[PDB]
Amino acid sequence: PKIHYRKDYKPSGFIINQVTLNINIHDQETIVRSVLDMDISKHNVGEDLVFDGVGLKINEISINNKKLVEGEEYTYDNEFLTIFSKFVPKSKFAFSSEVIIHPETNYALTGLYKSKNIIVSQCEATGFRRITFFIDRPDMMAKYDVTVTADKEKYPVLLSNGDKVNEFEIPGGRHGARFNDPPLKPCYLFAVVAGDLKHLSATYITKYTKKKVELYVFSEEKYVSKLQWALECLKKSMAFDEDYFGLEYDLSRLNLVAVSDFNVGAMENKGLNIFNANSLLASKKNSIDFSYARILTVVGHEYFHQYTGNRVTLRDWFQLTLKEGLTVHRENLFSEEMTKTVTTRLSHVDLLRSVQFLEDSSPLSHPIRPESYVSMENFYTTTVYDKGSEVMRMYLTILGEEYYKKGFDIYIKKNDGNTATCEDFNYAMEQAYKMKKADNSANLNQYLLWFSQSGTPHVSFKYNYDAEKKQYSIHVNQYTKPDENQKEKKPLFIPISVGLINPENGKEMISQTTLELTKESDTFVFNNIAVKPIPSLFRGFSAPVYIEDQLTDEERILLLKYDSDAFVRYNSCTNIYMKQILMNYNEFLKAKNEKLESFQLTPVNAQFIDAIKYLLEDPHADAGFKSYIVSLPQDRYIINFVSNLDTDVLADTKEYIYKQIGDKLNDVYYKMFKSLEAKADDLTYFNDESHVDFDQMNMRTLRNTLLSLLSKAQYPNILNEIIEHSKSPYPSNWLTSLSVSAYFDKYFELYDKTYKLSKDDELLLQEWLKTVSRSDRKDIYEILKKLENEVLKDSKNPNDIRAVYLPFTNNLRRFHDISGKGYKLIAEVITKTDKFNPMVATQLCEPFKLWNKLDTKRQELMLNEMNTMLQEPQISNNLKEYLLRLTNK
Template sequence: MDRLDGQTLPQTEPALIRREDYTPPDYRVDRIDLHVDIRDGGTIVTSRLVVTGNPDRAANAPLVLDGQDQELIYLKMDGEDVPPCRYVVQPECMVIEEVPDRAVLEIRTRIHPEKNTALEGLYKSGSMYCTQCEAEGFRRIAYFIDRPDNMALFTTTIEADKASCPVLLSNGNPVGEGELPEGRHWAKWEDPFRKPAYLFALVAGDLVPVKDSFVTASGRKVDLRIYVEKGNEDKCDHAMVSLKKSMRWDEEVFGLEYDLDIFMIVAVSDFNMGAMENKGLNVFNAKYVLAKPDTATDTDYQLIEGIIAHEYFHNWTGNRVTCRDWFQLSLKEGLTVFRDQEFSADMNARSVKRIQDVRGLRAAQFPEDAGPMAHPVRPDSYIEINNFYTATVYEKGAEVVRMYHTLLGAEGFRKGMDLYFQRHDGQAVTCEDFCVAMEDANGADLTQFRRWYEQAGTPQVTAQGRYDATAKTYTLTIDQTTPPTPGQPVKQPVLMPMAMGLVGSVSKSDLPLQLEGENAPQGTDRVLRVTEARQVFT
């Protein structure tokens, strides 16, 4: 790398990022104390980073901090100014040389939320300041190792004008607030759980809270807050009920209890995403929160219930256990879509919900799998990460998780989930780690099942049944094939669970099923493990 002594280098073409090239970061940020001073004409961000080196890093490896659209005011290391000869600022990062195994950096920058038209990082919408940091938005707020496998402890202090921004919110629990001169005030938030920077959130504006509370299974009281613009307070009842249902369901079905003292939702009318699961501070587009019987349809109510649940469920599947890299996106999104589908099925009519989900899959994901943009649930490369948020990663990813559930049964799936959290709470992991947890918890071999993560395309399955009245046997022949997709001309058979049952033509009752080689019938519903291009079951 050419050194320009603190100057800015010209921007280069975006690089192709490949999953096989993953390496751990040379340094990690263990803790960040963030101070955000919001002012008209420029917001001053001061961050104190506790940085430790990776023992396996190359000798003399520099510290690379991601950062975009920031004006550097100063850089200090262990209390001393860093001379310009030891760092260089590029359009997308800052590179610092001669960083010891442990160092405390203090970095002050100026950003302009009111000019942030990318709507990533901290931006101003109307009179409100809001953030969107997934996937790589935090680097527009402060210099940081902005990748999901860098999980840090965050403390955030916000300063702003009290008249225009009376509400100051961030992740975690509130630990302090106070008045400042010139009509300004401050609030401090501390998140006791490590998280990657994409889960950071900050909201400052003129909002009003709708309040409630929830008592967890262990007896802790959690304050619940839905912040809305004035005049919308009467439209939050359904969202609050949905939140409390989600919290109770996650305890009862998966044994997962909420972990902070407060859970907050902010409804923003012009939020650029649908919703975002920031730790303890979910930010929603208002249409997925606000509803009244005289203006909302039944579908609106169901959609709000499902999306509230989805973002809340991320607290464990995505936040407490997150992704090692963005190739593992379906680890959190596919799993959480499956969980919100199951929640909605339990809250409403299960069969109707399943039909709705399959219709959505056929309408959006099947064409994607059959087109020029077909990609596996766990893709192998990307240039622009924001193009990764696809029906394949989300909806097909949820169907892959559902197949675990079908193969292992509800009890076996819960055992796998329990082991997954036991092993990986507080870690950034992979789809492989999830698969291994399912295997180890159930003594199963899911080697072939892994092809679902590797292969693109929709398998085409035909089934032909034949009843032998003389032998009183039923033979089911199943064929599977997957058409070629771009970059994958040859496909291998996948492990596919297929549930089946037989109904007597006279009795109209479910018949007991005994597969060839078994000594006795084993129930009336069986899950067949289809593993070959053609497989015959008798």
């Protein structure tokens, strides 16, 4: 098992200047002919010429139009083609090959593969070597000339990168298209698509150069009516890059293509972006609300790659966060501007502090720029993406918008058309930092630790107020726990966006302020502070850290009601909940451990419940925000604060707290559920696919959240509401009616009803599957078996498999059944999936990531299943590496 090390980066001894491909698609095989115009680089030391080539069937290979002979002049082991240096020319030469590959049986969905009736490629990160021989690394830049041929009836639409320069007929009912793409690119950005595709199109005119850009969005004919929102999102993305960053699209055409079988959300192939259908296609009748923000994000994300990834490239894969963290950051800016809802930022923070914090305290913890890898596929992680994006966002927080845009433009102008590393970006930001501080002595050298240091910092506070001096002090401390990557953690550059709230009137006491914490600890003093303030800390969540605010619940309630910053209000609510959860958890734990016949529980703070009611009843308050405050923190957020967590005790704890709040607020909940109906379910624009109202979707989120609370509580006659809800035109509503009906005898009636509504749309059926999987049912294991036998069956579609199993794994009480039956079940699914798609098998391992955080019995159960998976003779490299790292073996 070869380990690649970041420090070992060396430029290739070879150069590939030109790629000329002929891809001939036939019924039972695809023939790929390739000519590489190559050269010897200055780093060459007379070494063997080694190409990557995985699973290729060689018909012939040649150097300068002369056939090479196997064994004497080359070896091929199904992974590397080695041409011995004595047969390698010392000047410019041509390498050619013809190989056979088989897209029809390629269920790994990497390289060239068949998705339903569409032939499509996926080359990032190491997929191009599954199509033809190459030096398959991102610093090998080349020109591409690509011809594709196929049966015309089956594959009338042929696409690849660049300009289509020829179309032609071929004997036997075939046709071909030639695409020339003169600008240099890395091979992971190559793509080809063949199929009976239908489209929507539009023309965009750029802001400054006034260039006409043709926009095309493609799907299978069945779902062509689901393309409109994607096209609108693309237009929005282009406008935003123009308006915020001053960046225009440089090509004459951009294609987006939806396919049904895809490992991730989408892929930024140059001029030919390819998408999971669930992240491109939607309609009001056949999609839940979540799809609209999902398509906006993923379309935006792939578009913003055109600069941050495609025009400025990576030197090597260790720089992945330079294009991914930065593009996620660009997409976050875009989405926040488009939605104009505070929940957009809150949703990203909620995901970071649950999923990414879990990863960062797990054995899988890595910095956003890792030091080594075995399988590059395994490092497309929430750390690299989402913590990466927070690190990219902190530059904006530190610099402010004007100097951030200046630094960003320095980065683009200096590295456009070239490869780059994380240091290059830091360098450009540093130049802006100098301009901002107005001295060329300032530097961001410490900031680089954000790229190299793993783990989540903990930031804690103490306060002092001198009423006679009008002087306020914030004492701040930072600490990162040692782990396997660094024995000694160094202090980070942590920007702390802060406000000071006057507790008497809720007003701001100081102007916008960002504390720059660069040491292990510091004291920040403020003068002319007229009264003791309540501090509003890490506004906007200004650094990816554990925040310990040391505030009382009284102070937190005041922030929750009156602070100006959405995140601090949300965090103060979160903190109140966490204090309560930890206290009740330990009370339940003690009673269990000591086998108590009776015991006391600490009730929920009454003033907190009053504050929730106050906010819910405020008609000028935000519906999206409201849905967060009535929800306890995510289980994966909570687990970061409990050792040896007994999941049963946590389920009991949540139950208690929800029942406490519901006993006081259910009538308020019900009243609001009813009053919100008119605006939430307004049908005025139901048949206008370009009209998307994120505030209205948030009102539906709130209604569906309240309905779940009222259903669990068995609120009098709520089943009537549930039944009426199932008749709503909006899938978010009628799918909610299924999951909340879990607590009633009508569940399987709604099961059947909603299935009938979902079964004839591929993507809608997958949302139905998720709804069933996530249903709070005592008989959920029997239900899963039913899904397997009646709907899922032997599908190899990752959307199907993920929909059936992943939501169930979040069932705290049932997935973590003490028998270990849930662990057993998902381990069986992982092993089964790993036979044909190792990437998705690794995705299905997600519930195991917290294994060493659970109680000793569940730890043992999980570890047993992982060791069982590890001992499977046919385990993939990707899955083996992942489980080896996760189990510290």
